[PDB]
Amino acid sequence: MSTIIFGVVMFTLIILALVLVILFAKSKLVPT
Amino acid sequence: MEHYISLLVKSIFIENMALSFFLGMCTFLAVSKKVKTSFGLGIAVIVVLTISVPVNNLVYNLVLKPDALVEGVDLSFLNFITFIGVIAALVQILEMILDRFFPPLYNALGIFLPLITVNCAIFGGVSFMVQRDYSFAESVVYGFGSGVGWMLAIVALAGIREKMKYSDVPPGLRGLGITFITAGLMALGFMSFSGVQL
Amino acid sequence: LKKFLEDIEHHFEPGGKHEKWFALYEAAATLFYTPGLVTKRSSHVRDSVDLKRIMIMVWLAVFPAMFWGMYNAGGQAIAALNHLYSGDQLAAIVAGNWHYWLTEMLGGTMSSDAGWGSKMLLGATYFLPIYATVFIVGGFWEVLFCMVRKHEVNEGFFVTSILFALIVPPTLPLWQAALGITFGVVVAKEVFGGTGRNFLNPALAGRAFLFFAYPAQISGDLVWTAADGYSGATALSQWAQGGAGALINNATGQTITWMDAFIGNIPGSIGEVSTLALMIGAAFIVYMGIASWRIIGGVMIGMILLSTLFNVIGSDTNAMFNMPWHWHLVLGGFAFGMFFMATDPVSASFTNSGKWAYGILIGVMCVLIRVVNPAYPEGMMLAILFANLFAPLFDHVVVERNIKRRLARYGK
Amino acid sequence: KKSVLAPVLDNNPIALQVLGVCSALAVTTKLETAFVMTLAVMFVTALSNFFVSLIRNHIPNSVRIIVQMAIIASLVIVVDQILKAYLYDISKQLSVFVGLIITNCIVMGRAEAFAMKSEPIPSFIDGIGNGLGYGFVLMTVGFFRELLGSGKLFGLEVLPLISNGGWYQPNGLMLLAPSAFFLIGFMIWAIRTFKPEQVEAK
Amino acid sequence: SIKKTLFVVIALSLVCSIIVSAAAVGLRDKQKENAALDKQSKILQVAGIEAKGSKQIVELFNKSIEPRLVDFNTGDFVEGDAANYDQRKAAKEASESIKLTAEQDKAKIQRRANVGVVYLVKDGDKTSKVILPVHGNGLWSMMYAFVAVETDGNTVSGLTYYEQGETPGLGGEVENPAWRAQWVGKKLFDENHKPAIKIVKGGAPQGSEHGVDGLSGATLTSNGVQNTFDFWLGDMGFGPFLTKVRDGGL
Amino acid sequence: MITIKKGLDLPIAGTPSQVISDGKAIKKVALLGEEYVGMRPTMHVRVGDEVKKAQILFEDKKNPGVKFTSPVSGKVVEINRGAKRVLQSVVIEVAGDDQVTFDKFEANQLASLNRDAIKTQLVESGLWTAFRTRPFSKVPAIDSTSEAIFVTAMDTNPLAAEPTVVINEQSEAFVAGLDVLSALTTGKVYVCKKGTSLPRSQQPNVEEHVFDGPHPAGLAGTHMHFLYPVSADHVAWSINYQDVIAVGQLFLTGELYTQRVVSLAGPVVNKPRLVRTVMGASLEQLVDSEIMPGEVRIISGSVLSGTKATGPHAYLGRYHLQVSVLREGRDKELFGWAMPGKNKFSVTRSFLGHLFKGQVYNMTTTTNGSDRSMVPIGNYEKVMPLDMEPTLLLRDLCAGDSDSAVRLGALELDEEDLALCTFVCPGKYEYGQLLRECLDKIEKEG
Ligand SMILES: Cc1cc2nc3c(=O)[nH]c(=O)nc-3n(C[C@H](O)[C@H](O)[C@H](O)CO)c2cc1C
Ligand SMILES: COC1=C(OC)C(=O)C(CC=C(C)C)=C(C)C1=O
Ligand code: FES
């Protein structure tokens, strides 16, 4: 089940990376 | 460069992203009312499509392609979700650069970027590249040729629709109905080329 | 005649028993006699020109091409028939096709020594049924739309019908001609509101329908000569295969010289073969100011520049690279489209500067499709339809420059 | 019940909302691909609306699109895998357009406009209804294109082609892209003839 | 806010990923056999074997057809996993393919894999036919076909174009059964063993060993078919392989 | 000198003889209410009331302070109204010589007069209505000023009177009027004329510009396009030479000057000539015994841009200096559209008439065809000399797209500016009416 575990990890990491990039960008650009 | 010239022309005339494979039709038919509005939107599509297609070629070949990271592990079933994420990411990155470092450029293009966040043309262009198994060099030619054809089509439709202010379309076809007929007639003109016998 | 038209006028006016046929009545009454209407507001005098005369001059301008086309279609058919069959076999072929024995029944002959009368008569049997079918079927759609929208029948269908009939193979089936004209009139013209309100050439849109829907009957080596069982390529196809040396007329065994193509002694579409006949007709309408010489000048500029560029570049594989500009002029439908189809004022650009760009685009596209597109030997219909899409765009560029000048008070 | 049949003619996604056009033009060359695409869109739209409505009260507004597209894409991936396993021949004909269901404006349109502000069961019904209207256009356009371009319906010969000893010559343009635009445009003309309230003002 | 946002995203991603990964992996084996059965059915058809059910196709393909790798340069068999070899993918790799020159590239394919796969149709234990996969560029797209050759290495037993994109009325007639039936009994080579199969424009003579009728109104596609067999019967294709077959191979 | 190439001079028979002669005795005159753009009249007179010369008849609601005064002394006999009670005309029967007098100055001090003093005298005398603004061709507001006042000292209209003959008789008044205009304008005064010599004002801000070429070289719209382009923020005023003479007489004698010299001409006029008349003179009495028998149309102004003088409109217009008479062209011709046309005039070369360069035509009011859609064979570009795209501008007018028309230069145009476009239109469109509807819509939303 290496493919399943690799699929689960990569799917989560790809989304987490995308979310973190947007959150970091929003905090450093959008004025408050 | 007969192979590259044929690919560029075929993607523009016989396999146009708008009039042949019908990508971005919802945006193509609606925002084409005015030439100035369509011209700015077309450039935004060109920029994103010309960069996202080669980038996703690398991501697919480095990770998603079979035996890319670990031998015996195929992550190609993540193509759909990964392409959506990277397309959305690159769009947001472009908004960050243009709205912060090139305010004149953001005014011309950034106003349309939310419309093309999940547009079928950008996702469709990436999908066609992977299916046809293009190389990196062919992806760049396909990406540029696909984007130019989309802007060329929507701007041409916008000029036609402005000219149609003098038309006398029947009420049943007025608006959406006559636009479909107009776009179909534009498809006839674009079928002039299917390749280059250089 | 005049008294009869006046007497029946009240029947088609509102409240009469023939109100629904009012569209037909005005199409007939105004055809014979002028409306006799006076002006109502400023410019109490008017120019003598109207849409009827403009359309009738273009309709008459293609008569020399039409008559030569019937003569050439018969001449090509008769020559090929005597090349293939002879004696009893030729007699059986003549009896088996109604075109052939109708010509012989009306005093003509199918023999190799047939005069110009027999050749033109044989061409007439191929062209008149096509023209009659196109006129009746297209006219029905024109009248039906006008009756439904309660408008008078605008002019321009006479030009559309005759031009469509002259750009088809002589062997075209009648049912396809009815479908082709139906697509051109309804889809390209009538759903937009009729004459003057469309953007696409109606006759070429109808030909494009037949081009893609039924390519077997409008391309190849079996449709351009009206001789049963005869297969023969044309000059554009032959040049694409083997260049200038391949221009041989297999019906007679003689090479196709430049004068043969210029005069019109070649197979092809009915009304396209004679460049000299098209030039005579075009000269009359260009002089009258009906056709735009800016568009015609632009087409020549585009064709000459791109063809010369291909000759300079050269190619050891594609024989179309070495075709000169003057060979491009006399082959295919280039002359017909340039003189009578690129000059359609409604489909073309509305600015003088735009007309130059519009014409150049047609000339460039036509040569490009001929040379670098292997699927199609000709591209004039595709070039004009493609340029109809960008004709408004050329106008937009021109006016934006004009608006910028105005905003600067023209330099004050 | 009325909510199911409302998006068929009164609020058709393609004829009125201008949504889902991309697949309607491309896949309707055959009824088999048009029927499978109808089921796939109906399946994805109904389940995406159902799951989104379940978590509608917890989706952050900053990454709302990301959350919605995570559900929609996952369903489409499952549909793509199933099609390759049981309908490989039809799945090969659909080409990239199976993936393009993610970017179909109908799926995201109904999820945001309806599923975010409605109970899950009505959201499931709304997805089924919009799929029926979307499928109605696909099957109608696919019917004419296949019958006039091939003389076949679902691969069954209805009009005998001349090449097979028949009498009907297939129309080549029906298998080409311009025919799809024309059929939809005339289809809209017919719908708005019997539904005058949908006529756009001049 | 941030804690709630990450918890929802992570929980949603985990549930979606598990369903996606399970579906992709669980169905993977059935997906790859569907691709195989599609091509195996086509090879059975050109070989003249009747098979309708999916199980019938699998059992007949294993019993009657044995795929083998062939080196184009030498014409000798090569040991390898023939049932899983992908010639199209190998043709796009520089390490497993050679770039053709203008003189050699008769079929306009621009590349050729170093080793190809042939299918030996065996009736029991003795080879009866050999299936050669050939491809060449048509007017609109690349056309892929299977040609069945008798053990003499000269006689064609059948032809089948299984992937083409030509116009259905003009060029698509390569799939017409009447046109395919003409290839049965034709000779690929002359008495000098030169490639001699000819696509005759306007109709080949009724009594002809090498002539095949061209497609009506489709000269350009016929040239593509003629160029396809010219290249693949030459020294750059199955030339040396068919030379060894006629010498007493298989 | 500015030379005009694009344009058309109509060779219509019946050209006037450029000799001034006394006209018929005029017994009643009128002021036309529909010839003023955007004018909503408040009537100050009733039927039976006796009015003096230069006495106010009605006032404008939409343009406060502007007074329309009687040109003669007499009695109001009828106040004609049409659909929606629109003021057609107010007719005064001439009886007596009573008048209202104003201040008079010397020719030396005219250029030094205060602007407010000049405006007060012009408004009270009713001569303020001679000015028309550009855009919108309206009477200027009494509190507004213009940096450009254009004097139309030329006339290229068909059958038009030569301004040189009239100005030479009133040279002193013409120069005096120019001096008043020089003080009135905040910028310059543009006297637009041909190459013929005219009396000159000594003021440095009065400039003479020579325009040469065919019609519309003589129109004020053409002059503004080449000398002072107009827009929303650049408004210019125009006035004809005979009104400039009236301005000079007003400030020299203190009395309103209502004399006019109009050309009476056309195919059916027995003796075409210049006749002396009065403002608003009845055209039924002026044209009496001057016309050949048959059904004729009397036109106030030129054939290209004029008012059909029938019924309540049968009076000389405020801004019209000629009277054109034509036959009504009701004849039906068998295949007339297909005839060679030896005696048919056209801007195209589809008729044999253009082969005879010296031919004059007895043009009638016939339309020469039915109404159709526009087919741009390029006639508009041959007669439009301004730096505009005529075909695309006309399509906007037909389509009712006011916003696009403004961007294409509709604000620079008057109805007379599109008269040639209306003339040469194959589809028989009337672009003058379409332009006014677009201009009215623009003002309403402004
Ligand atoms: C010079 C000229 C050329 C024309 N050419 C064509 C033509 O090529 N095809 C056609 O259908 N109608 C033609 N017409 C007729 C008509 O203008 C055209 O159908 C418009 O598109 C009608 O709106 C022509 C008319 C003129 C005056
Ligand atoms: C040449 O001008 C034309 C006419 O008469 C002059 C027509 O009658 C008509 C009307 C024809 C029919 C069949 C109602 C057309 C369209 C036309 O172009
Ligand atoms: S379905 Fe809306 S853009 Fe594709």
Amino acid sitting at position C47 = D
Both tokens of D127, joined, read: 């997805």
Q: What is the spatial distance between Cα E165 and Cα E140, in angstroms, rounded to a whole number?
A: 6
CA nearest neighbour of E119 among E8, E176, E195, E39: E39
What distance in Å separates the CA atoms of residue F188 and residue F197, rounded to the nearest whole number?
20
SS3 content of chain E, % helix, strand, coil (to 5): 40, 25, 35
C358 vs C396: CA distance, rounded Å: 12
Comparing C-alpha atoms, which of F348, F369, F355 is closest to residue F424? F348
Phi/psi of residue D114, nearest 5 degrees: -115, -50
Cα C206 from Cα B92, distance rounded (Å):
47
Range 170-199 of D in CB contact (< 8 A) with E: 170, 172, 175
Contact with chain D for residue C212, Cβ under 8 A: yes
| Partner residues linked to F58 by β-bridges | F43, F68
Resolution (A): 2.7
Q: Counting one residue from A and one from E, how many pairs have CB atoms under 8 Å apart?
A: 33
Half-sphere exposure of E181 (CA within 13 A, CB side): 3
Same-domain check for residues C65 and C174: yes
**Residue type, position F347, single letter:** V
Give the C-alpha separation, F130 to F150, whole Å. 12
Domain count, chain C: 2
* Residue E12 belongs to a domain: no
Helices D31-54, D120-150: axis angle to 10 degrees equals 170
Query: From the CA of D101, how far away is ligand 3's center (Å)?
Result: 9
**Neighbour subunits, B (≥3 Cβ pairs < 8 A):** A, C, D, E, F
Give me the residue label for tokens 């379309």: B169
The DSSP call for residue E166 is: S
Distance from C-alpha of C73 to C-alpha of C79, rounded to nearest angstrom: 10
Distance CA C373, CA F310 (A): 67
- Cβ–Cβ contact B165 with F under 8 A: yes
How far, in Å, CA of F107 to CA of F51, rounded? 31
Nearest residue to C392 via CA among E230, E205, B38:
B38
E209, E187 contact by CB (below 8 A): yes
E strand or H helix at F224: helix F220-227
Residue nearest to atom 3 of ligand 3 (CA): B24
In a domain, E7, yes or no: no
Q: Any bridge partners for residue E68, and if so which?
A: E118
Token pair belonging to C130: 């096509």
Under 8 Å between Cβ of F151 and F190? yes
C191 φ, ψ to 5°? -70, -15
Give the phi and the psi of residue F57 in degrees, each rounded to 5.
-95, -50
In contact, E186 and E155? CB cutoff 8 Å: yes
Distance CA F198, CA F168 (A): 8
B151 and B42 in contact (C-beta within 8 Å)? yes
F148-152 sheet: strands from edge to edge: F2-3, F206-212, F188-193, F148-152, F236-240, F132-134
The answer to whether the beta carbons of residues F178 and F189 sit under 8 Å apart is yes
The answer to whether the Cβ–Cβ distance between B74 and A3 falls below 8 Å is yes
Q: Are residues A15 and E22, on separate chains, in Cβ contact within 8 Å?
A: no
Task: Test E20 with A7 for CB contact under 8 angstroms.
Answer: yes
Residue C308 lies in a domain: yes
Give the CA dihedral B131, B136, B140, B142, nearest 10 degrees.
Answer: -30
Phi, psi of E98 (to 5 degrees): -120, 140
Instruction: Note if the bond before F214 is cis, omega within 30 degrees.
Output: no
Domain count, chain D: 1
| Residue burial E47-81, b: 16+ Cβ < 10 Å; e: rest | bebebeeeeebbebbeebbebbbbebeebebeeee
Give how far Cα F221 sits from Cα of C412, F150, F213, F396, Å.
16, 10, 15, 20
Report the separation in Å between the CA atom of E2 and the middle of ligand 3, taken as the mean of its atom positions: 33
> Do the beta carbons of residue D151 and residue D159 sit within 8 Å?
yes
CA of C339 to the centre of ligand 2 (A): 21
DSSP state letters, F168-219: HHTHHHHHHHHHHHHHH-SSEEEEEE-SS-------TTEEEEEEESSTTTTS
**Chains interfacing with F (3 or more CB pairs < 8 Å):** B, C
- The two beta strands, F148-152 and F236-240, are parallel
Distance separating alpha carbons of residues A12 and D193, to the nearest angstrom: 51
F220, HSE (Cβ side, Cα atoms, 13 Å): 25
B74 CB within 8 Å of a chain A CB: yes
| Cβ-defined contact of C402 to F333 (cutoff 8 Å) | no
Residue listed under structure tokens 């008017």: C46
**Secondary structure in 3-state letters for chain C:** CHHHHHHCHHHHCCCCCCHHHHHHHHHHHHHHECCCCECCCCCCCCCCCCHHHHHHHHHHHCHHHHHHHHHHHHHHHHHHHHHHCCCHHHHHHHHHCHHHHHHHHCCCCCCCCCCHHHHHHHHHHHHHHHHHHHHHHHHHHHHHHHHHHCCCCCCCHHHHHHHHHHCCCCCCCHHHHHHHHHHHHHHCCHHHCCCCCCCCCHHHHHHHHHHHHCHHHCCCCCCCCCCCCCCCCCHHHHHHHHHHHHCEECCCCEECCHHHHHHCCCCCCCCCCCHHHHHHHHHHHHHCCCCCHHHHHHHHHHHHHHHHHHHHHCCCCCHHHHCCHHHHHHCCCHHHHHHHHCCCCCCCCCCHHHHHHHHHHHHHHHHHHHHHCCCCCCCHHHHHHHHHHHHHHHHHHHHHHHHHHHHCHHHC
- The domain at F2-23+99-253 falls in which architecture? 3-Layer(aba) Sandwich (3.40)
d(C-alpha D182, C-alpha D24), whole Å: 12
CA distance D179 to B181: 9
Question: Which residues make beta-bridge pairs with F42?
Answer: F59
CA angle centred on F263, ends F259 and F264, rounded to 5°:
115
Q: How was this structure determined?
A: cryo-EM
Q: Is E70 in contact with E118 (CB distance < 8 Å)? A: yes
Contacts of C127 (CB under 8 A, 6+ apart): C66, C69, C70, C73, C165, C170, C270
Contact between chains at C50 and F306 (C-beta distance less than 8 A): no
- The residues, ordered by sequence, that sit 6+ positions from C91 with a Cβ below 8 Å of its Cβ are none
Domain parsing of chain B, residue ranges: 1-198
Structure tokens at C330: 């006399």
F128's tokens: 């303020």
For F89, phi then psi, to 5°, come to: -160, 155
Beta strands D152-153 and E97-99, pairing class: unpaired
C75 located within any domain: yes
| Residue E217 to residue B94: CA distance in whole angstroms | 52
- Domain residue ranges of chain F, discontinuous segments joined by +: 2-23+99-253, 369-446
Q: How far is B75 from chain A (nearest CA, A)?
A: 7
> What is d(CA C157, CA C138) in angstroms, rounded to the nearest whole number?
8
Can you name the residues that pair with E149 across neighbouring β-strands? E130, E156
Cβ contact B18:B11 at 8 Å: no
Q: What CA–CA distances, in Å, run from C36 to A12, F12, F334, F369?
A: 83, 20, 11, 8
Q: Tell me whether strands E126-137 and E115-123 are parallel, antiparallel or unpaired.
A: antiparallel
Distances in Å between the Cα of F133 and the Cα atoms of C55, F188, F236 are 42, 15, 6
- For residue D184, the enclosing domain spans 1-202
Mind telling me how many Å the CA of F10 is from chain C's nearest CA? 10
E232-247 in b/e form (b: 16+ CB < 10 A) is: bbbebbbbbbbebbbe
CB E112 within 8 A of CB E97: yes
Among residues B125, B179, B182, B180, the alpha carbon closest in space to that of B148 is found at: B125
Q: Going by DSSP bridges, is the β-strand pair F273-278/F259-265 parallel, antiparallel, or unpaired?
A: antiparallel
Nearest 5°: the CA angle F203, F204, F208 is: 90
Q: Is residue E235 part of a domain?
A: yes
Please give, rounded to a whole number of angstroms, the shortest distance from the CA of E215 to a CA of chain D: 13
Residue spans of alpha helices (H) in F295-389: 379-383
Q: Which of C78, C65, C87 is nearest to C122 (CA)?
A: C78
Residues with Cβ < 8 Å from F36, sequence gap 6 or more?
A: F60, F68, F129, F138, F139, F318
Domain end among C192, C217, C242 = C217
Residue C210 exposed, middle or buried by CB count within 10 Å (0-12, 13-18, 19+): buried
Q: What is the amino acid identity at position C184?
A: G
- Per DSSP (E only), the strands in F302-390 are 306-308, 322-327
Residue A20: partners with Cβ closer than 8 Å, 6 or more residues away: none
**Single-letter code of the amino acid located at D8:** V
Q: Tell me which chain B residues have a C-beta less than 8 angstroms from the C-beta of D70.
A: 81
Q: Could you give the residue ranges of the DSSP H alpha helices within D2-104? A: 2-9, 21-26, 31-54, 64-86, 88-94
The answer to whether the CB of C327 falls within 8 A of the CB of C180 is no
Q: How far is CA F263 from the centre of its chain?
A: 13
- Asked whether the beta carbons of C206 and C197 are under 8 A apart, the reply is no
* Interface test with chain B among D22, D41, D44, by most B beta carbons within 10 Å: D22
**Residue C119's Cα: distance from chain center in Å?**
22
Measure the CA–CA gap between C49 and F364, rounded to whole angstroms: 14
CB B46 within 8 A of CB B119: no
d(CA C398, CA C388): 16
E runs forming strands in chain E: 65-71, 77-78, 97-99, 111-113, 115-123, 126-137, 142-150, 156-163, 198-200, 211-213
Please report where in the chains the tokens 């090929």 appear, as a residue. Answer: C80
Quick count: other Cβ atoms within 10 Å of Cβ F124? 17
From the CA of F367, how far away is ligand 2's center (Å)?
A: 19
Please state, as a whole number, how many other Cβ atoms lie within 10 Å of the Cβ of residue F308.
Answer: 18
Residue B194 in contact with partner chain C when CB distance is under 8 A: yes
What is the rounded distance in angstroms from the CA atom of residue D137 to the CA atom of residue D15?
A: 8
At position B113, the amino acid (one-letter code) is: L
Query: C54 and F375 in contact by Cβ < 8 A?
Result: yes
- Which chain E residues touch A12 with a CB distance below 8 Å? 10, 13-14, 17
Q: Is D22 in the pocket of ligand 3 (CB under 6 A)?
A: yes
For residue E15, the surrounding DSSP H or E stretch is helix E2-26
**CA D23 to ligand 3 centroid distance, Å:** 8
- For residue E227, is it within any domain? yes
Tell me if F392 sits within 8 A of C60, measured CB to CB.
no
CB atoms within 10 A of CB B76: 15
**3-state class of B32 per DSSP?**
helix
| Region for residue F48 given its phi and psi (left: phi exceeds 0; alpha: psi -120 to 50; beta: otherwise) | left
Q: Which helix or strand (DSSP H or E) is residue B48 part of? A: helix B35-59
Answer whether F427's CB lies under 8 Å from C51's CB. yes
Question: Which SS3 state, helix, strand or coil, does residue F299 take?
Answer: strand
For C377, phi then psi, to 5°, come to -75, -25
For residues F304 and F9, the answer to whether their CB atoms sit within 8 Å is: no
| B166–F contact, CB cutoff 8 A | yes
